Design a protein around this ligand. Structure first.
Ligand SMILES: OC[C@H]1N/C(=N\O)[C@H](O)[C@@H](O)[C@H]1O
Ligand SMILES: OC[C@H]1N/C(=N\O)[C@H](O)[C@@H](O)[C@H]1O
Ligand SMILES: OC[C@H]1N/C(=N\O)[C@H](O)[C@@H](O)[C@H]1O
Ligand SMILES: OC[C@H]1N/C(=N\O)[C@H](O)[C@@H](O)[C@H]1O
Lengths: 485, 485, 484, 484
């Protein structure tokens, strides 16, 4: 048996855009992501799958059923977001010098919050209250995240930007978005603080800027290929996180963290340890050193307005990245980690998921302990999961990763929960519905939810607060012989 | 949901030779099967795997744990056998004309039973009582089967017979074995009737004679290739069943049936329906017409001593057989049913097990309804299961077959239980330990039992007496795309 | 036996950018494609493989060896191109109103050619002459193609355009490229007509416009996603074809054709035949009806477009399966070029190292459809398979050659079969990993090796037939031993 | 380039029972093997495939075509056998005490040969003469083998023996077979010495005894499982070899050898070298030490066994991996001949249609070990692969031929390489599905087709070398595109 602390919580994470739509009356056409996935040119190019979010699992209407199953499964924590676009579907009054690079302060007071309240959609606000009240009534501790990728269209027209036209609303390329996100986050905290246990500002900002402006084959908006603009978006999102932290703290005493996309960097050969360190710098430390230590590049400076804006770290983990040394520095290798063939085996002989992601649970131990040792901030594992409609690998994937969290705690790391991605299948961005990450399988025709055998396994874990002796054998690699190569 | 009658029982089947040994003090070296699997020439030839039963899951010593898990899983029925060899390890007094073809009667009375009792091993008898009492204490209804393949060595030296020497104990080739089996069965019923709910005489006699004397590549004892001797063994086993039925009835009022190896015969093309009928005659009806209607070939005769010796039919089902018409009659086709490649796909694109057996749950409906329509005797599904260490396919296999039993009942067939093969992994005959059929995985080093996710699924079924709405999606074919081709 | 007419020739096709570089001294940095595959951002995005064409098979230096092997293989025809960038690496003085949509005429004469002559790189001109003379000396009939995708950088800066900046050299989006292309083509014919047997203006203009401005995941320059700009590019390249035809004919009496990317459109179900016809309209007929019948949409007849084609080069690899929809028709993934690599299609047919389905019947379909609509003679200017191991190529080669025999048998005038390609080469955005050669290239030494399919092709070419002994290869590669 | 000595010959091997039947008039029902594969019980058991050799490739009728193709392929050597059953289909009068264990001498002279002559089938004798003369006329050096597994039914009724009945004709279990074999072999040399270049007494006697009486799942006659009878069979066949050697030498001065089944024994870990040596003793040295040095266990020296060998025929397909145990050593499944069909071994190496691992290094190992122990010259009398598709064969062929070049380079006297086989044939208990031919056979028409490997072998044989152009095929077939 592997037993967890009495205060440790098992649960799940979910995003608004991916799960909300699907039931009558739930449609939210007012984001960049919505327009992006409906775009005829994006469709013809194959940048997006052609599946549409309004045909989704319908959490907007069916949230009670989701919660009923989560309670039956013994879950005790949930992390969800509000969609910015549903609360402010129309523009707010121009407030502030758009040409200044830095946003060091955003003043928000009771009077400004009351003005904002005049513009907010009240049906959306009341619906979210009805969702969150139900959530809390099933004994789920609630982490509220402010942002999980889609921006209101009045803040970002991604097609115009894809086209190389920067005269319109330009998303994370504009400090206006930074200013409005701060106000939005303070506002949400102001409205929902009675229901919330902890806050996250953002989900995976590094993915927003990285796939948006560099990894353009991923079909993430605005899909404009530019190193320079990727840096500018990342700079703005960092200061937005900081301003949102101050904003929430102005109305709440509760903890405020951030959720980030992690990979475990692994050396190809024993001569590649430095390459790993450089990769960890370039992908992880530079970001967290900005929002914790205020250290940033603009020249290399310390900003007092950035320093100390973080109470906890949300660790999103799926797989590793294998790196090797170069003359220039380091490179990541194809055929390991997230760059494998789908339903196959990596160059290391480890099985890959429906998404082509390599099975590597040890990497979670690596990531949790590395964060712990650098910053000594407590963490939650805010995402971990696998694309697997058949449920062949998921029982092993779940048990193995949960075990590595037990290992991290054992070594001294403060980790207070594990939240699987996800409770149910949902709309996987540019890939559409084909990538199924749910403990529960969704029939998209009826919206019925089904317990995959992994869900029964998770229920064993959660109800016992332990990997029990009876399922401990799942702490292993799925046998590769009967799977596709 | 698919709900079963309130009186319907879900459970499991297990064989003594396959599961008993493994714990200190459990060794039974006194069968033909034991000698067969230890034989140096059989090993060198690869007729047997080289694995040995004395390294097995240890039900002899660990039965309480097996039963504890079966109770936790909500099971309510079990079918097990006594090993003849453990009760009578030494020969009994010659009793009876060995040259007579037919055995129409075997007189057994109280006095003869008391004499037999002088020769029986009392430690073995008391141990089996301790096993069965525990079984009954977990609320399991008990089907006691008399015979599941291994014969005492004093009745069969399979190596001598393999060598073409018929001067020694010749197993089912001798009417002495028929006479002794009758006495053995009456004796066991006489000793255990207070603990038993229903009786089976034999498990799969058609396999004993078919693999023993025709399908010699299977490495079943005595492995002597002879159409003529296969017919003689089958003739003797039929009359043995009949004499055992009379013997048990002499001491018990309880129901007495038999368990038989079934395949669903399927036509290659729509012009092959007659081929199916001929296959059903040659593999199924000829046998059951003998022991129910007394009809047999010796010339084609009716034996009053055979007629009506059957209260119920145990249906063992794994997969189909595809047949086509010939000039001579019919032939079965490779690449379907049990003749596929391991961990692959059949010629019909259906996934195959670790044993190379094709996924075909519809065949169970075929078999149950065919039996029902011919004889109108109630049945139990006494075996159904899959070789699958990884547990990839078993969740689908279990749910799908259980569904087909619901279908058969719905159509009017009297089916009173479903017994999975098996509760735990065990020694799979000539194949050894590599073929794992358990709901529970066995670690053969420690003898610890582990719940595969299919076991959690079975528990849902059994505790609810239904395929619940939540697991109903498993009533489908395992997706082939992520599995080996 | 399947015997071809005595005049039928077997040979091969190759492209300058794909095969020329690799030997020191061969480097041509002056194209949009060179810049495109060296671009840091494109590399980081994975739009290009990171492989570089200067590490190629080195036809520039080693052409004599290529030709030696082709002769040993019994080949009697070759289609190659000159690279525009090599001949005119520096910008030409502006000549002509750039805002006019149509380019109906480009005046070229002796004096204008002599002027152009003074900008041309003479080292490049003499080298091509040396390559083509050696070609001719090995008995190879010569189809000279003017254009196989790279443009001089002075006509197209693809990174600027990718970035959404239209103030620079804009490639096929500008009538200046049309004008200069007409002049380039007249100029090359003027210099090389003594060596050339037939001309092609261009290779697969449909792919240039289609992957350049719509299929942007393919990493083709300039990778600017726009239906409107895709139409404009195609409009320009059509008129460039016509002006190039007139330009060549002003200096030569030899046949002038075009090489085009074809797929065989096949119905998913028997209820999808109309979808096939719509697909053929949208992908094939619209284009050829423009340059043959002058019919275009801008729906009019342009007399400067009409009749500008003597022959049709058919490039064929695989099929495309289509179904009817409400709005029209869609192509289906899991068939044709949209399959998993080294696997099988949704129909159970084997796929190549590139994920393309084995479907040789499609070639018969494409040849006979063209023949029945236009009655212009054809060459199969490309057909081949990405297959480093050589597992499928023997079957692929014999099966497709058989379909050409079928086409001829049914009445179609097909005059040659040119395999893609003689040796491995640089496969555009995919780099070197896609190996189409009858000959394998060791890129470290530039040595060529005969894959067994080359021995099989020698049998066909030397005999002018699929011989009795290799006739079994007219079948699908057995899928059981291959990856699924 | 890898050039062979000028005297080195490339060719092929084939067996009478596997290749002769198929043409009407060729049927030979008089062997144990014929009876064995027609047996109803064996068929029902799956011990034999159900395929029948009378539906074969038809070398009996079509030998001229086989030879025509072999000549076109540049082959200069052939090893075949006469079928005993064809020459003596009826029982010979009993001659000699059958209960004596040793057969140290068999007296054969002119008069005894003339007597035998009166029992011989003359139609069969003349037909073989016609086949061998046509062979010789195509420039093929001729190795005549006396025995390649089938015995006349009058010497072995395999079904009787399978059933455990030892009162009938018992094949290699009886010294009568030894006696008659010596006489048969002297007789054939007597009739055919004018046509023959070198002799082999027998093909793979280790397999006859080993699969016949131990590996009974292989479906080899008589399939009676007995360690003791396996030893007795092997003892008899050894002395039959020796008596056959003396018999041939009484009528001929030509070289007399033996063809044997080899595997290259390889250690699982570096701690398994002793296991390899024990494996080589138990599978190879014990046998050759008997017929070369007269050393045998009955542990003595037999002067009638000593020195009865001029040359060694090495049959090689794959390796066997072994490990040390307490009791000795064991062979490991997942390597060598014990792999899954059309997949990869535990070492990641591709396997054939028969499940045999690609391991050409083993041939170098086997050739040099023999050479170093005995210093007798060798021929590679079999090497090939079950591969209907021809995916692996080009690599298999070139790689193994290279290892022969390696062996010669290191000093071993190897004089030829004979591929198994020229055309597909009847693969014993497996039937026709295992196709080893350089030429594919259509069994419906008996037509032969050149797989691309045949074109590759023509390159090797005609040049007497692995040429520069095919040298890349000296490598492992890429596993990525193949089934796993
Ligand atoms: O891929 C599954 C999830 N993975 C994620 N990060 O890796 C995203 O936060 C989430 O929205 C889903 O995309
Ligand atoms: O193959 C699994 C089981 N199958 C059986 N019949 O098919 C036997 O009764 C049982 O003992 C096990 O062999
Ligand atoms: O893909 C192989 C070839 N195929 C082509 N068209 O499909 C191009 O003309 C040629 O340049 C190569 O890309
Ligand atoms: O397996 C291919 C050949 N291999 C053989 N030995 O391994 C036999 O000599 C020959 O008759 C064929 O069986």
């Amino acid at each position: 048996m592997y037993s967890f602390p009495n205060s440790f919580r098992f649960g799940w994470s979910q995003a608004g855009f991916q799960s909300e739509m699907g039931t009558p009356g739930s449609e939210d056409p007012n984001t960049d992501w919505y327009k992006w996935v409906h775009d005829p040119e994006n469709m013809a190019a194959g940048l997006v799958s052609g599946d549409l979010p309004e045909n989704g699992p319908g959490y907007w209407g069916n949230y009670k059923t989701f919660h009923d199953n989560a309670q039956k499964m013994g879950l005790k924590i949930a992390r969800l977001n509000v969609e910015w676009s549903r609360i402010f579907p129309n523009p707010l009054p121009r407030p502030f010098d758009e040409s200044k690079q830095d946003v060091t302060e955003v003043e928000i007071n009771e009077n400004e919050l009351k003005r904002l309240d005049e513009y907010a959609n009240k049906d959306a606000l009341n619906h979210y209250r009805e969702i969150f009240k139900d959530l809390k009534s099933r004994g789920l501790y609630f982490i509220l995240n402010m942002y999980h990728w889609p921006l209101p269209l009045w803040l970002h027209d991604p097609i115009r930007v894809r086209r190389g036209d920067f005269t319109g609303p330009s998303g994370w390329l504009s400090t206006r978005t930074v200013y409005e996100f701060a106000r939005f986050s303070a506002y949400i905290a102001w409205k929902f603080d009675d229901l919330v246990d902890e806050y996250s500002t953002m989900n995976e900002p590094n993915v927003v800027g990285g796939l948006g402006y560099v990894g353009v084959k991923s079909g993430f908006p605005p899909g404009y290929l530019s190193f320079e603009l990727s840096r500018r978006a990342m700079y703005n999102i960092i200061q937005a996180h900081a301003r949102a932290y101050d904003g929430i703290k102005s109305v709440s005493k509760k903890p405020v963290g951030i959720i980030y996309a992690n990979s475990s960097f692994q050396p190809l050969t024993d001569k590649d340890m430095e390459a790993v360190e450089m990769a960890e710098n370039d992908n992880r430390w530079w970001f967290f050193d900005a929002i914790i230590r205020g250290e940033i590049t603009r020249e290399k400076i310390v900003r007092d307005d950035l320093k100390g804006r973080l109470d906890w770290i949300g660790v999103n983990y799926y797989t590793r990245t294998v790196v090797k040394r170069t003359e220039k520095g380091y490179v990541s290798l194809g055929g390991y980690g997230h760059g494998c063939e789908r339903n196959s085996v990596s160059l290391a002989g480890l099985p890959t998921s429906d998404f082509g992601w390599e099975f590597f649970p040890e990497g979670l131990y690596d990531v949790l302990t590395k964060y712990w040792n650098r910053y000594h901030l407590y963490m939650y594992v805010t995402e971990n999961g696998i694309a697997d409609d058949a449920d062949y690998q998921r029982p092993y994937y779940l048990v193995s990763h949960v075990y590595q969290v037990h290992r991290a705690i054992n070594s001294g790391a403060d980790v207070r929960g594990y939240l699987h991605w996800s409770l149910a299948d949902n709309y996987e961005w540019a890939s559409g519905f084909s990538m199924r990450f749910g403990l529960l399988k969704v029939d998209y025709n009826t919206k019925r939810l089904y317990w995959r055998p992994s869900a029964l396994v998770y229920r064993e874990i959660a109800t016992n607060g332990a990997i029990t002796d009876e399922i401990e054998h799942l702490n292993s690699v799925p046998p590769v012989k009967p799977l596709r190569h």
